[PDB]
Amino acid sequence: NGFPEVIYGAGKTATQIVGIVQALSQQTLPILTTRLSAEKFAALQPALPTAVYHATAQCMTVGEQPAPKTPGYIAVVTAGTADQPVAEEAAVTAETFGNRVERVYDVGVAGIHRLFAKLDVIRGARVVIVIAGMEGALASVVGGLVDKPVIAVPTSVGYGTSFQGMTALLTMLNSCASGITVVNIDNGFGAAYSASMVNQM
Template identity: 70%
Template sequence: MEQNNLKDLLMEVASGRADVTDAMDKINNSGFAELDFAKVDLAREKRNGYPEVIYGEGKTAEQIVGIMQVMAQNKLNILGTRISKEKFEIIKESNQNAVYFEKARCVTVTNHEIPTTESYVAIVTAGTSDMDVAEEAAITAETYGNKVERVYDVGVAGISRLFNRLDVIQGAKVVIVIAGMEGALASVVGGLIDSPLIAVPTSVGYGTSFGGVTPLLTMLNSCASGITVVNIDNGFGAGYSASMMNHL
């Protein structure tokens, strides 16, 4: 549906000149809603099983609100990532159902309930400094109906901490390991489990960690089998992929 047609249609609905059901059919059948600043993919959940996700960096709060309004009209669950607290304050004014997770910098709006899985995703971090990325992964997975177990601050510098929670990690259907510095934790955990492992390098570390490049290379070169690596600080990508695996 063209941008001007969508605006006209919404105005007609607001004024009572158009039927809401007919208007929504027209929007849904177009596959996407075109705004001044975005083409909102309304058919992604039908194609991929998950609705479009709003990436907040580089977008104004007003743009995020506009996208969320279109998604809410289509009864889509909403996940927004990398959204600051200041932007959320503006978002909250337009949608009282929006929930903000400050550590994860994520916003969620539940427009229909999703059953929670019996199996769970374990999210493991090397250190407390990796928790921002871990929480982005956790909120993503939970938004898509996954049970999540958090195992934080169990890095290789104090390996006994890891073994103390090994039963939780080994019981997971999917494991996400998040580490900065040298990124060794993914290799260690990968040698102790029989589940898929998604490794997330973080930008945490001193100079020669090169903003996450060092742990990225460590994880890519791991000798442990069954490890998949996502981009630096990409908690969302890890949580999304883990959800797909956990729902198989």
């Protein structure tokens, strides 16, 4: 293994979270808490002063991460700014797992030139995580322009025929470019977990 300790933040209370963190207090292992609301990080902030909270990602990391474990990096590519929350959930979990992360945000195919401008970075990552909602055309465009494993995270942003991520998920599952592999809606952590395993072979 060699992964840190992860805490899910949805069904657990701010108290329950502190109790799990104090149980894993020894060893100086990094602890990640995902999907942790801002209000559920207010109550416990007096409890853990040495903890950091990534507001957009709703993730909280207590304990110093040492260096990256590999020189390579993972690129987190997003289609629109509405994707940045699950994107930062992915990028923060990857960085906590000891990965260098290069964020290429808001490069949707509506403005396709923006994506080509950052292609040198995207093509040089060991893994690419593409995060998009609405219509997941970005996963397919990037998938056909890189030669590295791509993990697609569809996002639940959007009303109507967006279906809170279903259309994006179906698009990514139908991606023409082979080598795209998909995770569940908003699962920015699960992508970074699989991406971290690939990067850190």
